[PDB]
DNA sequence: GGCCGTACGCT
DNA sequence: GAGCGTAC
DNA sequence: GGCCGTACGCTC
DNA sequence: GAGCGTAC
């Protein structure tokens, strides 16, 4: 479950979506209990691009995120109802971490589009040398402390281009995803 | 600040490629995925040979995880379990003791309750590994060394098959008969322009460990020619005549990768939903002595032959094997045909045997050089001893022996490291006998390296040796 | 066949009862360890997990211990290893752990997969001289491995780290003690075997908990040391800080041993809610790794803080008792022992360990000297030695010829044949002679220890003083009187 | 949790109370699905001698056994309502296995006394050694301890009721001192 | 120490 | 009163 | 990879 | 379809 911060001011508050419970336990100890909140994600999260609304809304992890942000989804989404002004994706420096990150960005683009537009979604930058093995106090000093941390602001430059990208990479149609891998790596 | 489109494209590609080249797809050379290779190399490094007693699974997994596989224990353990299952692997790679699960889909008992070691056929996958036959690479942390590929003295990719779900692609290679496969490699080595129809004279089709039946050579031919095709797997079922005009269906063999308990559950679902009629009783009489036995009792008025044909179409009693022969060729995925798979395997064998011969020649030339020094010493042993005795230090002794007896550093060092027992009658004769046999050995290795046909024949002879020792009868009957 | 229900109940229960007593819940008096602890520490030693080497994943340490010595569940091995790495559980921690090993709030350690471990520097002293025939080795559960029945234990671990085990028909509860005080007690006992428990109390003041705190009186300690049973009152370290004008605050810096800090705070919160205690405005846990244990209790102005604190000792686990029940396995059997008995059995184990080590070292020294005597003969008659070897057809004839011609033993003859040609150089001849002379003086020293009981006892004393000066530390628990 | 057999004839039917789920999974695969039923017991079972009726009746493990046998307990016990004529205690060949066995016999003596009198309670004899029940393969577990033609079951017989009553009270009761004395006297 | 969520592709 | 620590 | 049953004895 | 097999 979500380990929330003491402050109720969303402007100064921030949420960290951590990969796993062990990392989650380390993040909840190293964090600033006043401004930082932690939401642990149990492994791979549901791909909303391949799923229908009934599955998405019934999904435990998807539900937990909506409740944590308290904004709602789709047409009922309200930016003023946001509980955090900074939604930080904190995954392992491995290939699976990058996958969980894509799955989260797929959910945020299709259900919380104005959240990315407002520049509320960020990506944590841990060094490539995973979160499950990351040291307690060092995890705060490298990717959490506002002074020397390096967060990547997720910006939407082209909406038409992005729409086709998520459809190709995360969509049901395998054939176009195969051609993308072939073109950008195999050949 | 990072662009969402650029972030999605880069992150997904990093994962997609890692699942392709380092997870879900097997290598064309040894037929293994990284997890399988790391288990088998682990078992070898741990000295878990077939002659030695079983070791607890948690300990085997721990070592594999700690030095080669930085992933979850269950991923390593479950991959090891399948390798010990005689119904999953046509030629099992792991010899397990305890509960390793059955055909009814019930899993293996947890690591702590099971013990394992490698099978005799696995020694053939790791044969000549420490003879500079394969390239070694740095592990995940760089504190250990791991093989990029195993020598694989038998065509494992086609022998045990592969079934892996990657990103943008997947693989589904059926298991084959070793005797048939080796004969195919031998036919390819004699004729490099061999047709896939001519290779099919040796390799009739897939050979499943669960036996069963294959409907037509047509699907097999397509799979072997294109790398893709559908093969119809049918259960071995007999309709026996009984007293009072009654009949019954007896299933003795089931299709590959089919859950026996789930198949029985499906027949029971059709009887309750009244989707099939003429069935009075459904029993699972499977025992260790008779093997697989599924008894279906037929009603007097109902035609058993009709019910059986309906069971093939409605239940997994007849399942299809969707062939999609994708293996990593030069670290890249490729849809390969039967010939392509055997070509890449034979080319790997040529490299493994050539590299072994090159390694063995280096060690033979080095040993002969040492023996030449010991032979000089044994001819002038009074002079050798006097030279050593007059020397204050080992450095002066080395200097004096090299200058007086025209020896090298390696030669002079070997003489100083020579034990007094080497001076006995038999021990002198042993040094001379070893040297003579070694000269003839150097000659034999030089003959292999000079002529490609001599090398190819050695590859052929070694493959025939595997075929005569590990080769077995065909299990799956291919019907026309 | 048919079995009687009464006979089946009596036989089966006795088998379990005895196994829990002699091979589970009770520690040995000699090394102060239960079988699980001994198997973990021997495992860490066999795995080469010394303090100088990098940490190894807990699942791998447990796997080896389980597979070789402990045929029980992974959690039983892991949790026992965890306690040994906890600085609040063990006065002298036996395991050096990396990661989450739990805290005083009763929250457990992170799963075996997320933790790494190795032994502490003090653990090397428990395993010191183990491969020197000091202790008896026994067959493991399957008979495919060898395990120690007891560790040499060069420091009195039973009293140093205590014990708390629930057996069948009995239980044990030994408090931890200060090493400097304990070694001083052993040294006093070695000088006077008829020492009184009151005289041993001049060195060993009382129990010394890793969680520090306070002890109310010496009376309860005296009973525990004289009979093996007694109640010791443990009180928290609390100060009434004058926080301003008429305002006050109680600050708890130390808590009693084996007390859950979070559950203790939960009890104070229970009393405030139920109105069982008055004068408390706020209750906070300001405990951090840098500051240590810190429990802040805010008092109302014009309300007596000293009265509330005294009520908190009576009503909450802020003041808990330690029920001493000193039961350890003495000659493979449980026994309620006093302070003197515990030190007597420990000192007697040290005498045996040092005597056996000296006996082992002398055997190896006499064996090496015998070999060097053969090599010395060979180096004086080189030409003759070589001619004898050369004329021989086989190694068997060479052995027979060397033994007969140079009056050598079977072992001496083998050593000469295994001797390398480089041993014939100037320095190598002098090296053999120098080793032999030093070895004769070594044999003399070991023979002096074995001949006189006092020389042996002094070596035991000197080695114990060496442990005291290296691993000895200040007292943590203040004994108030 | 109970993996029941196909046959509904109690005279030919039998239940095996196995120690653990791993052993349970092995037993349910190696068994004769027609005459043999399996009930896995997750570790140590509640000691009914030290517990009051409200705890015994609310205990998950205790509840599952009563439902499996379908006889009832105490005064409402009916031998005619028995689902199995053979209740086999199948525990590991270790010291803890013997303890679970005592705990089960304590429940059977205090709540299902005529079940022992009728000779319905049996003790399985698995191969002795370091290897447990969950460590064994499914086929050898049937050949050695389950097959009626090769197995060796021990019939639990009640010779003296007054003697047994005092034994269960001493060994499994709340007063420790009498149990301590027994261990000290019979210690080997 | 058993229960059990998700990605990924094919048929 | 309930919870310590090795076991299943 | 978190949730969580039981035995066993002692003293609150 | 749903379930194969390595991943979190
Ligand atoms: C489910 O499969 C079986 C389970 C069991 C029990 C068990 C039983 C439980 C239950 C939990 C447990 C669990 O205990 C937990 O272990 C945890 C391990 O980490 C430590 C830190 O904390 C422990 C908990 O304090 C404890 O509650 C098992 C561990 O090993 C066992 O023997 C325990 O919650 C419900 O019923 C027996 C079997 O037959 C052999 C089984 O087949
Ligand atoms: C609970 O805390 C976390 C859980 C997870 C998931 C997970 C999630 C689950 C769930 C189960 C699992 C479980 O998967 C199970 O593994 C089992 C291992 O034995 C084999 C026999 O059978 C496997 C199950 O088929 C599989 O389903 C975890 C194992 O490793 C994981 O990554 C899995 O049931 C409900 O939701 C991820 C986390 O962060 C990374 C967490 O913090
Ligand atoms: Mn990771
Ligand atoms: Mn057991
Ligand atoms: Na079908």
Author numbering:
A (entry chain D): 417 to 545, 582 to 639
B (entry chain C): 11 to 490
C (entry chain A): 10 to 490
D (entry chain B): 417 to 545, 580 to 638
Paper lines:
Bacteria have two well-conserved topo2As, DNA gyrase and topoisomerase IV (topo IV), which allow for dual targeting by antibacterials, affording reduced spontaneous resistance. DNA gyrase consists of two subunits, GyrA and GyrB, and functions as an A2B2 tetramer, as does topo IV, which consists of ParC and ParE subunits. Topo2As regulate DNA topology by creating a four base-pair-staggered double-stranded break (DSB) in one DNA duplex, passing another DNA duplex through this break and then resealing the break. As part of a structure-based approach to develop novel bacterial topo2A pharmacophores, we co-crystallized and determined structures of DNA-cleavage complexes of the S. aureus B27-A56(GKdel) fusion truncate (gyraseCORE) with QPT-1, etoposide and moxifloxacin.
With etoposide and moxifloxacin, we solved 2.80 and 2.95 Å DNA-cleavage complex structures in a P21 unit cell with two complexes in the asymmetric unit. In DNA-cleavage assays, QPT-1 and moxifloxacin stabilized DSBs with S. aureus DNA gyrase, whereas etoposide stabilized both single-stranded breaks (SSB) and DSBs. We found that etoposide has activity against both S. aureus and Escherichia coli topo2As, through the stabilization of DNA-cleavage complexes, and that etoposide has dual-targeting activities for gyrase and topo IV. In our co-crystal structures of etoposide with S. aureus gyrase, the central hydroxyl of the dimethoxy phenol group of etoposide (ring E in Fig. 1b) interacts with the same main-chain N–H of Asp437 of GyrB as QPT-1. In contrast, in the S. aureus etoposide structures the equivalent residues, GyrA Ser84 and Glu88, do not make specific interactions with etoposide. The binding mode for etoposide in S. aureus is similar to that observed in the 2.1 Å human topo2β complex, which has two etoposide molecules bound. The two S. aureus gyrase complexes with two etoposides bound (BA_BA'2–etop and BA_BA'2–etop) were both in the half-open Casym conformation. All three Casym structures (both 2.8 Å etoposide complexes with two compounds bound and one of the 3.15 Å QPT-1 complexes) have angles between two subunits at DNA gate of 173.5±0.6° (compared with 179.4°–179.9° for CRsym structures) indicative of a ‘half-open' conformation at the DNA gate. In a Casym complex, one active site is ‘open' with relatively little contact between the two protein subunits, whereas the other active site is closed and is quite similar to the configuration seen in a CRsym active conformation. Relative to a CRsym structure, the catalytic TyrP in the Casym etoposide complexes has shifted by 4 Å on the ‘open' half and only 1.4 Å on the closed half.
